[PDB]
Amino acid sequence: MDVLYSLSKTLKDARDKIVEGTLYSNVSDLIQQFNQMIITMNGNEFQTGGIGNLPIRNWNFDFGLLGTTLLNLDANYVETARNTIDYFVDFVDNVCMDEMVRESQRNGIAPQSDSLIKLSGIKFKRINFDNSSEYIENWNLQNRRQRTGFTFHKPNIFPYSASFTLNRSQPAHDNLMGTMWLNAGSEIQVAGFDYSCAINAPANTQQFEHIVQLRRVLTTATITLLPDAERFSFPRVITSADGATTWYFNPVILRPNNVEIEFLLNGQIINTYQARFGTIIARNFDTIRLSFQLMRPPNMTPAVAALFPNAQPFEHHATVGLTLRIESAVCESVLADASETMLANVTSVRQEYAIPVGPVFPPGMNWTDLITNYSPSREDNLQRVFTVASIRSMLVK
Amino acid sequence: MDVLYSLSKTLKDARDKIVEGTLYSNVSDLIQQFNQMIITMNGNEFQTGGIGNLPIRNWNFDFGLLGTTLLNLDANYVETARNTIDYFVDFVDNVCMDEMVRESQRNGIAPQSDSLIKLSGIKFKRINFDNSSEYIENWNLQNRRQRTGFTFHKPNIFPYSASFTLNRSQPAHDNLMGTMWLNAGSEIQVAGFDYSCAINAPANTQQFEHIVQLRRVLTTATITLLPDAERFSFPRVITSADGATTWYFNPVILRPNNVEIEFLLNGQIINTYQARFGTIIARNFDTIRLSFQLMRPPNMTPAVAALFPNAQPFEHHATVGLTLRIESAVCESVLADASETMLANVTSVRQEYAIPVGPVFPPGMNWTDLITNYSPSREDNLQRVFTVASIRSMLVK
Amino acid sequence: MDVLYSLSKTLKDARDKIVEGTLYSNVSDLIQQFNQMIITMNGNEFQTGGIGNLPIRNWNFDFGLLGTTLLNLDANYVETARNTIDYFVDFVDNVCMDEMVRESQRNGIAPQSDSLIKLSGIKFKRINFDNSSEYIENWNLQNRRQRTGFTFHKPNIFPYSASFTLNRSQPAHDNLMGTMWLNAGSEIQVAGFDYSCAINAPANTQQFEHIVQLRRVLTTATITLLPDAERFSFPRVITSADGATTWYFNPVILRPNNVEIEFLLNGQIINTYQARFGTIIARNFDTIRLSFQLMRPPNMTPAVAALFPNAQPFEHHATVGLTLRIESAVCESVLADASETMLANVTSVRQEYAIPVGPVFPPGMNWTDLITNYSPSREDNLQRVFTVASIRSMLVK
Ligand SMILES: [Ca+2]
Ligand SMILES: [Ca+2]
Ligand SMILES: [Ca+2]
Ligand SMILES: [Ca+2]
Ligand SMILES: [Cl-]
Ligand SMILES: [Zn+2]
């Protein structure tokens, strides 16, 4: 993997650096590395493709070195360099694509592709240079078994699920207290509702909890908590848990009470925030538990009093909601995120060449399926593909 | 354009690299390039400005080289270097600003500015070095007619439009089925509504479609699909298509049914997703067609049954909605996006110097106007300004 | 601060660059800098920690140089290098953490930590190299008193506040016109409501204003304006300004009228946008004033007419709303933002070692408290911690 990165990294620098009219000193070190790459590559045959719709290509390297005598580079020098760069960029691109579409249950980390396997051989190690990328650096650390972290803006950590639970239920479905939620992407929305409005409830208060457990630990996250949920604040007709019938939800929205958010790792509270809205920091967590309460208003003006009356039927149902978004976090595992293009790159290559379903990855490379049962085997496989995708993007965007 | 980039790129590196107490070896290659820039620049006169409120400046270069003999740099060396760097940073800044405010219908790609025209002359080519930026690299590829892509987080691709269509209409405006939408930025929201609730409708089902066509093709995009639209879920009084009268919309929200999203390029479906929510990938597309259906509930509890009754008047109107956001994509054309600062930079310079309206660009450099009729002429002009803006930001943020 | 940056910067490059099998030419300049760092460091003792729960560590440097004779690096060379790199990475990490947790009212900019104070001494200046980071570059400019800017995606500029004002009020709280808002993060939402619907109002029109004043000036921002506010579009029971009673808000939503947004700096309008939605640019501002009007519909279909009737009670209350998000801006002061991880890093270190409350910073390092009274003293302190946090992230993520 490291060797493949360097081939790309060199080719990229060669493209940026070798420009007509530039001083030789600017590119002298680069010319040496580029040449060393040609010497190592030369005389080897590489075969890629033949899986799915991906064509089989044979790659042959027999190139001359670049000159080291000009003071400033010229159009001639640049043209010669380009021909070598082009053939090389194409090979790397293909080697990457071939890697991207494979997976192994037993040894996910090891390179699947024949071309990648050949490179990881001893002779080629010379090509290796300058592994400064966030993905390569992380790749290097993992082999040494050191700590690593990827930084995500809007981490994609919550598999999509929308649901509700009815804490008190009737067939009439006319006097219900339950929470409903959406967890999608980096955003959690939780709503607690009482049809009664807690007129019965001891202390006149109703207590709701949502607990969300993440697949992977997150560190140094930045999050926003907002009182209320926009999503669950409008009237809906809702299909039913059994699936038999449909209830009706009509809400009136009251400020949540006695809110707490707890961020827990192994069930020790690490961070706890009470009645705090806006940006908050959770340093380390694997679970979030949100607690909020519905409190009946002790004093009501006349219009309010009409809304909540002492016995059914109740027209308007009291709801309290929270919204939590993780803006950025750090993970020790790769995840899809808003900014990065890796899931998109891997998914697209697989889609285009009609790769058949593979044991390691859910069909279509669906994120929700993948994040839902994100096993160690999947994690190994995901990183190897992601790194190659990153490598590929250096050259082919 | 390439020469201008290097002037900037050198000046930037000179600022980062030439610091007091540093080893000469660290900056030796840089000193050579910096000096070469001084030799090339020296003896030339450049004139900029005089368009709008932008002042006319005359630029004269007569500077000595930097020394190459110290072991570690010192306060003296740094002070001398700074004076040259300052004059140079100012010139570049101005040359850029002068470029930013001009445009041509006939030859948008070619540099408009007198200063930029002079630089693109043969002698100056020597200054050229190290074109590694995403904007410069893309600039280089386009001249060679190779494939290019810019990567956007939250691409700004949908011109702002909010509208509705009434599929069934009455002057009473009391029994209406129609879709309403918002397309803004990277976000599409579509809502389908039936006042009847489809009690009449064949199969008890009502089918809605929204088709959105983008101005430019997008590749390897990451998108979120969420059932329901928050925007169209609350009651509104709406002005009317003729503009004569106003209707009333009151919605009750039901899960959309038989949802499909299709991503099409030249009217071949490239990607199709059915009943899938959360993150999905569209590898290549120029059109999105969203299809969803409204299905009357076969079974209704008593409160639900009250909501939809067999003949008018109907108090509550059934609605089904979708939300689609493109988190990140790749385009072969420049676009405004959430992260980048180029539209802001170009627009601000034009605003500040009171540049008169130009044929190529809509007045005020408005994005919606620009994206709405994003012609080849505009695209050429947009990139040249954007690259200069990027160049300028290296030095002047 | 500059010296600390370089120690880190060197160590980072040493980790990326010194890899087995690489050509010596690739790392020769680096080896020279790395060695120079060892020579400067050697023979000095540094003590860190002892504040809060942070352990006291003693640091001793006595290391040999790296060899300069191999053609390509080998496993041996790499292993030797790593041992030096490790001890060094640990020290830097600790020096940073020690810096992060301190603050001074009197001299915020100067380094608080004993280790940092020792480094800023004359002998160590030699280590200094290559200050190219956005944070370090900004640090350098500020000392020279030059202009600086940080670029934020989703700047965190509005302290969280949710409120309302009642322009016309009754104890009944049954005929009210008032605005309500949320300002959180980079997002401003404003809603104007009339229970009457302006049937009384002169010209049949009702005019609302929201004025928001930011703590720091912002330049070249990109913003989205959307008609309507999702947040205030659903019915709520609201506690009351006195806190005594609760009113009831039920809204019907009408398009805002005669919208203007003004961006002002020192109370001169810099940018003014009328009836413009979608992306707009504000080049320079310290205040936003949003103006919108509620206009009674001259023509109403029968269902609409029912909604607004001539005398109380009024069931449905007319509302008009605006949403404004700043996607990206530039500030001359550091701010928390969606992408960056600095507030999270500083906050987490303080949380973990149980640092006692400090005079400069609000307890818990809360952003809303900090942004609300963002004094010059806080700003000085915030930057020094932020730069160290950035430095630390180079090495320890
Ligand atoms: Ca765990
Ligand atoms: Ca309602
Ligand atoms: Ca097309
Ligand atoms: Ca000011
Ligand atoms: Cl975002
Ligand atoms: Zn973002």
Numbering used by the authors:
A (entry chain A), B (entry chain A), C (entry chain A): 1 to 397
From the reporting publication:
In this study, we used a K2 Summit direct detector (Gatan, Inc., Pleasanton, CA) to collect a single particle data set of rotavirus double-layered particle (DLP) and estimate the critical exposure of a non-crystalline specimen. Rotavirus DLP is a spherical particle with a diameter of about 700 Å and a molecular mass of about 70 MDa. The capsid has icosahedral symmetry and consists predominantly of viral proteins VP2 and VP6, forming an inner and outer layer, respectively. VP6 assembles into 260 trimers that arrange in a T = 13 surface lattice containing a total of 780 VP6 monomers.
The T = 13 lattice enables 13-fold averaging of density in addition to the 60-fold icosahedral symmetry. The large size of DLP and its high symmetry make it an ideal specimen for this study, yielding high-contrast particles with very low-alignment errors and almost a thousand averaged subunits per particle. At the estimated resolution of 2.6 Å, atomic model building is possible and an atomic model obtained by refinement of a previously published structure agrees well with the starting model as indicated by an RMSD of 0.4 Å. Calculating the Fourier Shell Correlation (FSC) between the VP6 map and the refined atomic model demonstrated a resolution of ∼2.7 Å. The density of carboxyl groups (e.g., Asp29) fades most rapidly and is already partially gone after an exposure of about 3 e−/Å2, while those of aromatic groups (e.g., Tyr24) persists even after an exposure of about 35–40 e−/Å2.
